[PDB]
Amino acid sequence: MSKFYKIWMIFDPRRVFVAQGVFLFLLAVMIHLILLSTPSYNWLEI
Amino acid sequence: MSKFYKIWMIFDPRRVFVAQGVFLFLLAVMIHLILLSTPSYNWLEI
Amino acid sequence: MSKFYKIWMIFDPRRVFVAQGVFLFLLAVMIHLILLSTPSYNWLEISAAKYNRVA
Amino acid sequence: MSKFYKIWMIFDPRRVFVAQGVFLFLLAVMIHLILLSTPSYNWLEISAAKYNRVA
Amino acid sequence: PKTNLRLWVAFQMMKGAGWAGGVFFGTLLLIGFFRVVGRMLPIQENQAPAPNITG
Amino acid sequence: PKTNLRLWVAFQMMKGAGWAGGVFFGTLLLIGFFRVVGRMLPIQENQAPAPNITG
Amino acid sequence: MVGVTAFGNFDLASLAIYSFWIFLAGLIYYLQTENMREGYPLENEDGTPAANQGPFPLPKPKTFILPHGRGTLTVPGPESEDRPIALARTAVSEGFPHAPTGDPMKDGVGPASWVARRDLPELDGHGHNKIKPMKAAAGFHVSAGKNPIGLPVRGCDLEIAGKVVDIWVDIPEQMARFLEVELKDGSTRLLPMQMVKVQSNRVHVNALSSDLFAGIPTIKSPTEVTLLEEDKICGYVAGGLMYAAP
Amino acid sequence: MAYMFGIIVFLAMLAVCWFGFMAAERQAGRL
Amino acid sequence: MAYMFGIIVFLAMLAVCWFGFMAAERQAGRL
Amino acid sequence: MAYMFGIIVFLAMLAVCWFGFMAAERQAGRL
Amino acid sequence: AEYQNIFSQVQVRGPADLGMTEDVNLANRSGVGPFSTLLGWFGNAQLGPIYLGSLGVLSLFSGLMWFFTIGIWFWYQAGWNPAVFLRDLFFFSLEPPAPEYGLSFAAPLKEGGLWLIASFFMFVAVWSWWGRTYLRAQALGMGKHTAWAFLSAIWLWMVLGFIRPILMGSWSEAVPYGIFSHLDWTNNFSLVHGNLFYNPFHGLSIAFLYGSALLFAMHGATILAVSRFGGERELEQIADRGTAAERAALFWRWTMGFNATMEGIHRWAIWMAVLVTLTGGIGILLSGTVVDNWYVWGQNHGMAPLN
Amino acid sequence: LGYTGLTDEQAQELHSVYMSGLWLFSAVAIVAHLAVYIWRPWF
Amino acid sequence: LGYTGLTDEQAQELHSVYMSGLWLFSAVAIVAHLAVYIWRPWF
Amino acid sequence: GYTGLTDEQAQELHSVYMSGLWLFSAVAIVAHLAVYIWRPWF
Amino acid sequence: ALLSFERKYRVPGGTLVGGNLFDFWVGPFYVGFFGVATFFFAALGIILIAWSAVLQGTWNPQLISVYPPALEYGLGGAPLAKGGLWQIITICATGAFVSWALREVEICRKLGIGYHIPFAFAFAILAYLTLVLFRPVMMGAWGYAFPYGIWTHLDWVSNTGYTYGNFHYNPAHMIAISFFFTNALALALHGALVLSAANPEKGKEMRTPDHEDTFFRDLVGYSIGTLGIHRLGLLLSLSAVFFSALCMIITGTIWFDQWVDWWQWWVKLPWWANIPGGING
Ligand SMILES: CCCCCCCCCCCCCC(=O)OC[C@H](COP(=O)(O)OCC(O)COP(=O)(O)OC[C@@H](COC(=O)CCCCCCCCCCCCC)OC(=O)CCCCCCCCCCCCC)OC(=O)CCCCCCCCCCCCC
Ligand code: BCL
Ligand SMILES: CC[C@H]1c2cc3[nH]c4c(c3C)C(=O)[C@H](C(=O)OC)c4c3nc(cc4[nH]c(cc(n2)[C@@H]1C)c(C(C)=O)c4C)[C@@H](C)[C@@H]3CCC(=O)OC/C=C(\C)CCC[C@H](C)CCC[C@H](C)CCCC(C)C
Ligand SMILES: CC[C@H]1c2cc3[nH]c4c(c3C)C(=O)[C@H](C(=O)OC)c4c3nc(cc4[nH]c(cc(n2)[C@@H]1C)c(C(C)=O)c4C)[C@@H](C)[C@@H]3CCC(=O)OC/C=C(\C)CCC[C@H](C)CCC[C@H](C)CCCC(C)C
Ligand SMILES: CCCCCCCCCCCCCCCC(=O)OC[C@H](CO[C@H]1O[C@H](CS(=O)(=O)O)[C@@H](O)[C@H](O)[C@H]1O)OC(=O)CCCCCCCCCCCCCCC
Ligand SMILES: COC(C)(C)CCC/C(C)=C/C=C/C(C)=C/C=C/C(C)=C/C=C/C=C(C)/C=C/C=C(\C)CC/C=C(\C)CCC=C(C)C
Ligand SMILES: COC(C)(C)CCC/C(C)=C/C=C/C(C)=C/C=C/C(C)=C/C=C/C=C(C)/C=C/C=C(\C)CC/C=C(\C)CCC=C(C)C
Ligand SMILES: COC(C)(C)CCC/C(C)=C/C=C/C(C)=C/C=C/C(C)=C/C=C/C=C(C)/C=C/C=C(\C)CC/C=C(\C)CCC=C(C)C
Ligand SMILES: COC(C)(C)CCC/C(C)=C/C=C/C(C)=C/C=C/C(C)=C/C=C/C=C(C)/C=C/C=C(\C)CC/C=C(\C)CCC=C(C)C
Ligand SMILES: COC(C)(C)CCC/C(C)=C/C=C/C(C)=C/C=C/C(C)=C/C=C/C=C(C)/C=C/C=C(\C)CC/C=C(\C)CCC=C(C)C
Ligand SMILES: COC(C)(C)CCC/C(C)=C/C=C/C(C)=C/C=C/C(C)=C/C=C/C=C(C)/C=C/C=C(\C)CC/C=C(\C)CCC=C(C)C
Ligand SMILES: COC(C)(C)CCC/C(C)=C/C=C/C(C)=C/C=C/C(C)=C/C=C\C=C(C)\C=C\C=C(/C)CC/C=C(\C)CCC=C(C)C
Ligand SMILES: [Fe+3]
């Protein structure tokens, strides 16, 4: 750490958190879809 | 609705919302388990 | 090497960190997809063959 | 050869450094992809054979 | 109080993820509509030959 | 502001559902530990007869 | 000629396709340099000539000869802003926005921008004022559609700003080009016809709150509008979409 | 057909949610 | 056996999260 | 034998990251 | 929702507008036609006046005779029956001479003579319309861009009906006059020449045909988007650049990194459209004369896989 | 620098709020990964 | 010379924190490469 | 000059640029030498 | 670097997402939130195409071809080498095209212009999604989509068309073609007419829009006008793409046979079906 908190003096936290919510949701969807595309992990094929 | 808001003068909303969070989570888990117990909906049996 | 800090006198950090952020995510995603494209290194299929799942 | 520093009188370093960054990345990606296309040099397929990792 | 700051960061992220979820599931329901109409039509009887040589 | 009241109700419910989630998944991991130890032991070889007449 | 090659696989259809790639590269160079007759040379944000002017050179000057004695235009040419711009940098680096230093609607910057066009009317082919109030062109009348004259004009705040008192028509094109609105002090303004919705009982101006109608730049003659005045009016109204606050 | 009637039932349910949600923003818009 | 080594790896990861979470409550306990 | 030597190389790489990180922290105190 | 300027809200009608004189021989210009309130919602309401004169009469009479010659053949193929004429209207076809007749004018009237007669009236009608398109611009002192643009379409049409039949050595190569039959001809042409998709000039011609829909969508949407600034008055924006032209230029510069001008976008427009039929005409002229199987030509030129 | 107009103390405070949630979110993720690895391991 | 407006000491400040992140991120990555090489070496 | 760099600003900036060039190529030479040891291409 | 008039327009705001976090330019290009999204998907989709070229084993750019999953995979996932790369590149294409439209909406807001351009572009996106998504989902297999390859996607057009005989007989395909040809006619005329006024005979003054109206009235007895022609060029382009999408969404979902056989409904109308003579009698 030491000074990693200084990122909030470069980038406006309000905007970053909204943009990070979009990223993390799409990353989660991406990984679920990678697994759903794989036969040994397609839980929706019952 | 009319006067249903008066329930917050009977029961302390702070306590009700915490108790309602517990209820809704356990209800959700219950229904997922009912489905997981049923062969045509057991998505975890891959 | 002791003057490489002067890069921040050439380029504004607000643009550089955005560019780097996209770059590092893009590079990582392509390497994972390249390995998943490869039968020797597709970990999800290595585990399926290991555990006698659908392969 | 000592006056090569006058390149920066002609070309703005902000343009050069961005252009250079793009160019060197795409060249490196080009060469790594060419080798992955080359069976004698595809390190993933070489190690697959070395360790009998399929069939 | 620090808790109001905890909840404000959560709220900003749920704004982002909520919109991204609205587009994802809204797309999935549009795909669902075309799948439902595909089920209503006589397509499995009259199923067309594959147009690509990969099959 | 009304938004601070929206987030306070969400926070109270997430307190409840978070604790209820912690006991559910904590139980599921305790069950997981006994399943992992069951896999390590020679039980499938020496599998016991059913103790109930329903089988 | 079928199958006849000069060398390799190079038949007469190869000669054609390679000749076309040379023609296309020449044509694209011609097209892009023609499109550099406005807005070049490129500038730094301070206004000095940018060290990077891009790969294409400026074309040789052409001269347009303007009708009705209005002189000649040479392009490319000396191309100053010819007006003050009330903007200040928000960063020392290039590529960031410049924030309005005062009231951007009235300073005329951003989407409220306007250009120092010629302070004369646009003319028709005969040399009459192209755009006129309809009362000043006796044959004209509203031949179909809801006649707006006499309707109240509502802002996006949903309050009445004024009433429509005339239509300003493009004479050669025979189309409605502005609505004249009489405000609550009896001074009028022109509204661009494309910025208003002529509803059944009202004209709705979604760009302006009812107070902002007094700020609309006024025309100096009540019987004609200059190209400079048009740009100021049209710019100001469109600027409201960004800058009209609730 | 009479299956897709159910798809419409869910859309009727989702219209009730819209009417309820906007009403909840009305019946105390401090109003 | 050498599978359950992985179960321990996840517990090591979860101890790092605890150490990080408490540190985050320390390095600005207004402190 | 590139297994063993591989382990060593990765452990050598990490020692350079330790040097560089401590060097950065040795700069970052307004040195 | 706001106003999009796609249909007009209010129509105004002045007097009839007779238009510019310049060097137009005004005796040859008709009276003004009626106004259409329907057209006024989308564009101008005024019909007419129209200029006739010498190349006008020549073109309109030859074009009438072309149309009438086909129509009578269709009435004959219908057996004069007015019901069959409407049933089979899209199935009638005036076919060119059979291959055994080559280029000779000796084919019987029912075996291709009427197709030559019809094609002669088409030839005169189209070429006299070209000269009319040149001279109407000359009388107004305008540039000849419209006549030179029309020459690019004539090039493809001449290749289809005249030049390639001559170079192939029979009128049987030409297009039949008929709704479905010119479609059957178009399909059969591609099959005989081994899939026309692998003709590179058919590929180019499609690129410019898609590009013309791309570019007119971009340009039409751009001008409507800036029409609130009077950007549809493009000649005054060329003479005296307003905020409309600058906002249009900066939209595309900020979007795709480069932009046109108000004059220069119409050069992109004319060339994108002209190149459709220029490259098209070349691609047909090469078909059968130089390449008889485009798919195999594609295999030898690195665009299809080898067998 | 100081492009956002936060003070240094405001930034130190907010970063701890953010970091506390980061370790919580990743701790929940580890529990979900540990559950999945017990049920259906991928190594 | 400065195109960004950062003073020299500000640039040294920003760089030293930037390099801390680079070495940290690259350390985490080496441990991932080490684990993967232990599991399935590519040489 | 077009950039407006003074001669000393250009000569300063070149010296640091040369340092990155020699560093980057030095790493690349180790990478080539390793792969030539591992699998010669000549 | 700026156009000489550009500076007065580079104000803050108009962004739909991200506020000022991405409200900056990179050379001429505006970035914004969706510019970041656009570049990521564009770069990923391009790079996965180059990687598919490695798996395919060609470097000739005209032979590179990324095929969709075979019909045996249905609408499920396929292996990356065998259709799964196509699926990810289709996601990236959709992400890039949609982000590009949304980035255009932000630029419209900052310049205060109408939204006609991103709205028109959304028609092209829907035609793309018809061919890769909606129609394959209706027909039940990703393999009915076209392959990403310069010439191999023309094989898909050919093979899809000839599945239904001559595809010229699709009646919506005929209407789409009529708009496509008419649009190209109107673009030739509009370009030429504006240029002929701005570039008259040598020594003459610039012509007015009155001369433009006059030339076309003299030529054809009508003139749509300066505003009408830009409405027409937009609607002709959009109609062409609407009827193109329509012609395909019906093909293989409600119509299965040779399209030429459709036109018999007119021939066999009972008031004239049996009348002797003609072509069909
Ligand atoms: C299948 C058929 C297809 C067919 C494809 C379609 C073909 C038919 C359409 C033809 C359109 C012609 C386009 C044109 O006129 O270009 C000149 C014009 C002039 O702009 P300018 O403003 O007056 O001058 C340039 C400069 O002053 C702009 O400002 P600045 O210097 O501050 O920033 C630079 C720009 C982009 O500039 C460049 O990338 C370098 C110049 C490119 C010239 C291209 C033509 C000549 C060289 C071609 C061979 C160059 C070989 C190296 O902004 C940035 O750099 C910011 C970073 C974002 C861009 C990253 C790009 C990464 C590298 C990707 C590879 C790019 C290759 C050009 O604009 C530009 O220079 C930038 C254009 C960027 C988009 C071009 C898209 C069209 C296709 C590629 C170019 C045409 C050749 C096919
Ligand atoms: C099975 C069918 C074949 C095929 C066979 C052909 C053939 C054969 C030809 C084309 C040609 C064309 N094809 Mg192909 N084509 C196929 C598949 C396609 C596909 C697709 C998605 O699959 C597309 C988009 C196209 C697209 C096109 C165009 C780019 C091109 C025509 C340009 C033009 O403007 O013509 C329309 C314009 C004209 C014909 C010019 C007309 C000008 C004259 C002067 C007008 C006179 C008017 C008259 C007097 C009437 C007046 C009435 C007034 C009211 C007064 N083809 C397949 C592979 N295609 C042509 C070409 O150029 O090929 C290279 C061509 O000859
Ligand atoms: C560059 C490529 C594009 C192109 C360009 C183009 N075409 C052009 C032009 C240009 C630039 C013109 O200037 C020219 C024009 O005038 O346009 C308005 C033209 C034109 N493009 C035309 C058509 C056309 N263009 C096409 C395509 C293309 N045109 C390409 C897409 C197509 C097709 C199939 O794609 C067609 C059908 C025409 C509208 C026009 C050429 C007109 C012409 O030559 O007409 C000859 C025929 C006649 C003059 C008359 C025919 C018969 C009528 C029924 C009149 C009868 C009158 C008589 C007195 C009646 C008496 C009745 C009695 C019983 C009383
Ligand atoms: C709807 C009417 C017409 C239309 C309109 C239209 N297109 C538009 C616009 C408009 C109004 C824009 O604003 C926009 C633009 O910016 O234009 C410059 C655009 C545009 N129309 C384009 C192309 C295009 N339009 C076409 C068609 C049409 N566009 C219609 C006919 C066609 C074809 C084949 O008909 C093409 C190729 C672009 C120039 C541009 C959109 C640029 C864009 O999306 O940029 C972001 C994405 C990238 C830079 C690259 C993405 C890379 C992918 C992730 C990987 C590649 C995947 C792809 C599926 C591979 C295909 C291989 C082929 C061989 C099959
Ligand atoms: C809190 C949230 C809780 C969520 C709970 C879980 C919900 C899960 C269900 C979601 C419901 C909707 C799913 C869609 C409809 C459906 O049932 O489909 C089920 C079918 C399976 O059909 C199969 O069956 C089909 C027959 S049938 O439909 O069953 O009759 C058959 O035709 C097909 O071949 C076969 O594969 O699959 C699909 O339709 C595929 C979905 C594809 C989505 C990803 C696309 C990636 C590929 C490239 C395209 C990219 C496009 C990018 C666009 C941005
Ligand atoms: C503490 O500070 C931080 C570390 C948080 C920030 C530091 C400073 C900073 C500003 C960093 C910036 C980094 C950047 C700019 C990173 C950018 C990353 C990108 C562009 C990631 C993109 C990811 C995309 C994904 C995962 C896409 C998924 C799409 C899927 C799964 C398809 C299904 C989804 C949908 C249908 C919804 C979306 C719509 C379409 C059309 C796809
Ligand atoms: C055993 O086998 C079988 C299951 C098959 C057979 C079972 C047979 C059997 C014994 C069934 C018995 C069923 C019974 C006894 C059902 C009774 C149901 C009742 C009594 C339901 C009542 C519901 C009441 C409701 C939902 C009331 C809601 C009230 C509201 C929302 C208002 C709450 C209060 C306020 C807002 C405050 C008001 C004002 C002030 C000033 C505080
Ligand atoms: C609109 O109305 C208001 C929200 C304002 C409330 C109105 C006023 C009011 C006070 C209503 C009160 C209602 C009451 C008291 C309802 C009580 C309902 C109960 C007791 C529901 C219980 C549900 C239990 C469930 C769904 C259990 C699920 C268990 C599962 C799925 C197994 C997994 C669970 C665990 C590992 C934890 C289980 C618990 C323990 C202790 C081990
Ligand atoms: C086609 O077939 C194959 C691909 C198989 C083979 C052939 C490919 C081929 C033709 C390759 C050609 C390769 C070439 C031309 C490579 C050229 C490489 C170069 C010139 C690399 C240069 C690298 C330079 C670097 C990394 C410099 C970095 C500089 C740094 C880090 C410092 C920057 C300066 C400052 C921060 C100082 C700022 C100063 C002030 C006062 C503020
Ligand atoms: C192709 O690749 C595959 C798809 C195969 C794999 C993907 C490969 C790849 C490149 C993955 C990259 C992943 C990355 C870089 C992930 C990064 C994730 C990060 C940085 C996550 C950080 C999350 C931080 C959070 C959630 C912080 C939240 C802070 C908050 C909310 C404030 C504090 C508040 C609380 C603790 C209480 C919250 C409130 C309530 C009511 C519970
Ligand atoms: C198929 O092709 C292959 C994939 C095989 C090609 C492989 C070849 C190839 C081209 C690879 C390329 C790899 C490259 C170029 C990798 C480079 C990676 C870099 C540059 C990584 C850098 C990471 C840096 C980090 C994580 C920095 C973090 C900084 C932080 C956390 C601090 C942020 C700033 C502040 C807190 C503010 C500081 C102070 C003040 C006063 C504002
Ligand atoms: C209501 O009944 C009435 C009789 C009153 C009217 C009926 C009207 C009617 C039903 C008309 C039907 C018209 C149709 C369906 C026309 C279709 C035309 C089509 C689709 C034409 C397509 C292509 C034509 C081309 C490419 C023609 C090119 C011709 C050229 C280049 C001319 C070449 C010239 C010659 C070969 C002639 C050479 C002769 C001499 C003497 C040198
Ligand atoms: Fe135009």
Whether the CB-CB separation of O277 and K84 falls below 8 Å is answered with yes
Cis peptide before K305 (omega within 30 of 0): no
Whether the CB-CB separation of J10 and M33 falls below 8 Å is answered with yes
Give exposure, A3-31, as e/b (b: 16+ Cβ within 10 Å).
bebbbbbbbbbbbbbbbbbbeebbeeeee
Burial group, residue E30, by CB count within 10 angstroms (0-12, 13-18, 19+):
middle
Q: Is K22 annotated as a binding residue?
A: no
Question: O270-276: long-range contacts at Cβ-Cβ below 8 A with a sequence spacing of 24 or more?
Answer: O271/K83, O272/K83, O272/K84, O272/K86, O272/K87, O273/K87, O275/K81, O275/K83, O275/K84, O275/K87, O276/K79
Residue written as token pair 């070496």? M41
Atom number in ligand 11 closest to CA A3: 36
Give the range of the structural domain holding residue N34, as residue numbers without chain letter: 1-42
Whether the CB-CB separation of O115 and O105 falls below 8 Å is answered with yes
The neighbouring-strand residues paired with G63 are: G74
The minimum CA-CA distance between E6 and chain O, rounded to whole Å, is 20
DSSP string, G40-65: -S-B-TTSSBPS---SSPPPPPEEEE
> Can you list the alpha helix ranges (DSSP code H) found in chain E?
2-40
For F40, the closest chain I residue by CA position comes to: I1
Interface test with chain G among C8, C10, C15, by most G beta carbons within 10 Å:
C15
Nearest CA to O112 out of H11, N21, G206 is that of: G206
Computed over its alpha carbons, how large is the radius of gyration of chain L? 17
Tell me if residue L33 falls in helix, strand or coil: helix
Tell me if residue D51 falls in helix, strand or coil: coil
Nearest CA to E35 out of L9, C42, O138 is that of: O138
Q: Does C28 touch chain O (CB under 8 A)?
A: no
DSSP string, O36-68: HHHHHHHHHHHHHHHHHHHHHT---TTT--BPP
Q: Which ligand is nearest to the CA of K232?
A: 13
Ligand 4 site, residue K214, Cβ cutoff 6 A: yes
The Cα–Cα gap between G206 and G157 comes to: 9
The Cα–Cα gap between F11 and F8 comes to: 5
* Alpha-carbon separation of residue O51 from B1, C46, E45, O59 (angstroms): 61, 21, 38, 10
Residue K260: count of CB within 10 angstroms of its CB: 26
Residue written as token pair 């994108």? K272
* Alpha-carbon separation of residue M33 from I5, J6, M38 (angstroms): 18, 10, 8
Range 1-31 of I in CB contact (< 8 A) with L: 3, 6-7, 10, 13-14, 17-18, 20-21, 24-25, 27-28, 30
N38 CB-near residues (< 8 Å, 6+ apart): M43
The Cα–Cα gap between G151 and G153 comes to: 6
CA atoms within 13 A of residue B21's CA, in its CB half-sphere = 20
Whether the CB-CB separation of L35 and F32 falls below 8 Å is answered with yes
Residue written as token pair 């499938």? F44
As a whole number of angstroms, the longest Cα–Cα distance in chain C is 58
The neighbouring-strand residues paired with G132 are: G169
| Dihedral sign from CA coordinates of B4, B10, B11, B14 | positive
Interface test with chain M among A2, A3, A4, A11, by most M beta carbons within 10 Å:
A3
Strands G72-75 and G175-183: unpaired
Give one word for G183, left, alpha or beta, with left for phi > 0 and alpha for psi -120 to 50. beta
The Cα–Cα gap between O43 and K243 comes to: 35
The neighbouring-strand residues paired with G144 are: K11
Tell me if residue F19 falls in helix, strand or coil: helix
A contacts of L18 (beta carbons < 8 Å) = 13
As a whole number of angstroms, the longest Cα–Cα distance in chain E is 67
The Cα–Cα gap between K264 and K251 comes to: 16
Q: How far apart are the first and last CA of chain G?
A: 75
Tell me if residue E38 falls in helix, strand or coil: helix
The Cα–Cα gap between C3 and C1 comes to: 5
CA atoms within 13 A of residue O107's CA, in its CB half-sphere = 29
Chain CA centroid to CA G92, Å: 31
Whether the CB-CB separation of K8 and G177 falls below 8 Å is answered with no
K297 CB-near residues (< 8 Å, 6+ apart): G13, K194, K198, K291
Ligand 2 site, residue K107, Cβ cutoff 6 A: no
Distance K217 CA to ligand 13 centre (A): 11
Domains observed in chain B = 5-46 (4.10.220.20)
The Cα–Cα gap between K290 and G17 comes to: 13
DSSP C41: T
Q: Is K193 annotated as a binding residue?
A: no
Chain CA centroid to CA M23, Å: 4
The Cα–Cα gap between O33 and C18 comes to: 11
Tell me if residue G76 falls in helix, strand or coil: coil
Whether the CB-CB separation of O57 and K305 falls below 8 Å is answered with no
Smallest CA separation from ligand 9 atom 31, residue: N20
Nearest CA to C39 out of G13, D45, K63, J10 is that of: D45
Whether the CB-CB separation of O273 and K245 falls below 8 Å is answered with no
Taking an 8 Å cut-off on Cβ atoms, the answer to whether C9 and M12 are in contact is no
Q: Does C1 touch chain N (CB under 8 A)?
A: yes
Tell me if residue A39 falls in helix, strand or coil: helix
DSSP string, O210-243: HHHHHHHHHHHSB--HHHHHHHHHHHHHHHHHHH
The Cα–Cα gap between K194 and K192 comes to: 6
Ramachandran angles phi, psi of C39, nearest 5°:
-60, -30
The Cα–Cα gap between G136 and G156 comes to: 31
Distance O38 CA to ligand 4 centre (A): 13
Tell me if residue G163 falls in helix, strand or coil: strand
Ligand 8 binding pocket, CB closer than 6 Å: B 7, 11, 16, 20, 23, 26-27, 29-30, 33; F 23-24, 27
The Cα–Cα gap between E25 and H7 comes to: 16
The Cα–Cα gap between G153 and G206 comes to: 10
The tokens of F1 are what? 């502001």
Experimental method: cryo-EM
E contacts of H7 (beta carbons < 8 Å) = 36
Among L32, L34, L38, the residue with its CB nearest the CB of F35 is L38
The tokens of K62 are what? 């030859």
Q: Is K115 annotated as a binding residue?
A: no
Ligand 6 pocket test, pick from A10, A20, A26, A37 with the greatest ligand atom count within 8 Å of Cβ, gives A26
Q: What H or E segment, with its residue span, contains residue N9?
A: helix N7-38
As a 3-state breakdown, chain I gives helix, strand, coil percent values, each rounded to 5, of 75, 0, 25
Burial group, residue K265, by CB count within 10 angstroms (0-12, 13-18, 19+):
buried
The tokens of M8 are what? 């020299």
Burial group, residue D47, by CB count within 10 angstroms (0-12, 13-18, 19+):
middle
The tokens of K69 are what? 């010659």
The Cα–Cα gap between G3 and F47 comes to: 80
Burial group, residue O281, by CB count within 10 angstroms (0-12, 13-18, 19+):
middle
Taking an 8 Å cut-off on Cβ atoms, the answer to whether E36 and H7 are in contact is yes
The Cα–Cα gap between G103 and G86 comes to: 9
Smallest CA separation from ligand 1 atom 48, residue: G55
Strands G197-198 and G203-205: antiparallel
Give exposure, L18-30, as e/b (b: 16+ Cβ within 10 Å).
bbbbebeebbeeb
Nearest CA to A42 out of O257, G232, L40, J10 is that of: L40
K contacts of G146 (beta carbons < 8 Å) = 9-10
The Cα–Cα gap between O258 and O166 comes to: 8
Whether the CB-CB separation of B46 and A43 falls below 8 Å is answered with yes
Interface test with chain M among G93, G94, G96, by most M beta carbons within 10 Å:
G93
Whether the CB-CB separation of G59 and G35 falls below 8 Å is answered with no
The tokens of K135 are what? 């001279």
How many residues does this entry show for chain N?
42
Q: How far apart are the first and last CA of chain N?
A: 46
C20 CB-near residues (< 8 Å, 6+ apart): none
DSSP string, chain K: ----SSS-S-EEE-S------TT--GGGB-----B-HHHHTTS--BB---B-HHHHHHHHHHHHHHHHHHHHHHHHHTTT-HHHHHHSTTT--BPPPPGGGTT-TTS-GGGTHHHHHHHHHHHHHHHHHHHHHHHHHHHTT--SHHHHHHHHHHHHHHIIIIIHHHHHT-GGGSPPBSHHHHHHHHHHHHHHTT-GGG-HHHHHHHHHHHHHHHHHHHHHHHHHHTGGGTTT-HHHHHHS--HHHHHHHHHHHHHHS----TTTHHHHHHHHHHHHHHHHHHHHHTBTTTBS-HHHHHHHTTSS---
The Cα–Cα gap between O135 and O141 comes to: 9
| Dihedral sign from CA coordinates of G91, G94, G95, G97 | positive
K223 CB-near residues (< 8 Å, 6+ apart): K231, K232, K234, K248, O230
The Cα–Cα gap between I13 and L27 comes to: 8
Ligand 8 pocket test, pick from F12, F19, F23, F30 with the greatest ligand atom count within 8 Å of Cβ, gives F23
Distance C27 CA to ligand 11 centre (A): 10
Amino acid letter at G108? G
Burial group, residue O175, by CB count within 10 angstroms (0-12, 13-18, 19+):
middle
Nearest CA to K252 out of K219, K211, K275 is that of: K219
Smallest CA separation from ligand 1 atom 54, residue: O27
Tell me if residue D31 falls in helix, strand or coil: helix
The Cα–Cα gap between M27 and M17 comes to: 15
Q: Does G225 touch chain K (CB under 8 A)?
A: no
Q: Does C13 touch chain M (CB under 8 A)?
A: yes
Amino acid letter at D55? A
Ligand 3 site, residue K248, Cβ cutoff 6 A: no
Whether the CB-CB separation of K269 and K219 falls below 8 Å is answered with yes
Domain ranges in chain K are 6-143, 144-301
Whether the CB-CB separation of J29 and M16 falls below 8 Å is answered with no
Ligand 3 site, residue O26, Cβ cutoff 6 A: no
Q: Does A45 touch chain B (CB under 8 A)?
A: yes
The tokens of G94 are what? 């290039």
Among O19, O77, O87, the residue with its CB nearest the CB of A15 is O19
Q: Is K234 annotated as a binding residue?
A: yes
Chain CA centroid to CA M31, Å: 14
- CATH class label, O1-163: mainly alpha
Ligand 2 site, residue K206, Cβ cutoff 6 A: yes
The neighbouring-strand residues paired with G5 are: G11
The tokens of O230 are what? 């830009």
Ramachandran angles phi, psi of O66, nearest 5°:
-100, 105
The Cα–Cα gap between K151 and K126 comes to: 10
- CATH class label, K144-301: mainly alpha
* Alpha-carbon separation of residue C54 from A38, B46, C47, G41 (angstroms): 10, 9, 10, 65
Give exposure, N7-34, as e/b (b: 16+ Cβ within 10 Å).
eebbebbbebbeeeeeeeeeeeeeeeee
Whether the CB-CB separation of O191 and K149 falls below 8 Å is answered with yes
Distance I21 CA to ligand 9 centre (A): 43
Interface test with chain M among L1, L12, L43, by most M beta carbons within 10 Å:
L1
The Cα–Cα gap between I10 and L31 comes to: 8
Burial group, residue K104, by CB count within 10 angstroms (0-12, 13-18, 19+):
exposed
Strands G152-155 and G203-205: parallel
In G55-120, DSSP assigns E strands to 62-65, 72-75, 87-89, 98-100
- CATH class label, O164-263: mainly alpha
- How many domains in chain N? 1
Ligand 9 binding pocket, CB closer than 6 Å: C 3-4, 6-7, 9-10; D 24, 27, 30-31, 34; M 1; N 12-13, 16-17, 20-21, 24
Atom number in ligand 5 closest to CA O76: 36
The Cα–Cα gap between G85 and O6 comes to: 11
Give exposure, O223-241, as e/b (b: 16+ Cβ within 10 Å).
bbbbbbbbbbbbbbbbbbb
The CATH code of domain K6-143 reads 1.20.85.10
C23 CB-near residues (< 8 Å, 6+ apart): none
Ligand 1 pocket test, pick from K258, K267, K303 with the greatest ligand atom count within 8 Å of Cβ, gives K258
CA atoms within 13 A of residue G82's CA, in its CB half-sphere = 9
Q: What is the dihedral of CA O161, O162, O163, O164, to 10 degrees?
A: 80
Taking an 8 Å cut-off on Cβ atoms, the answer to whether G91 and C12 are in contact is yes
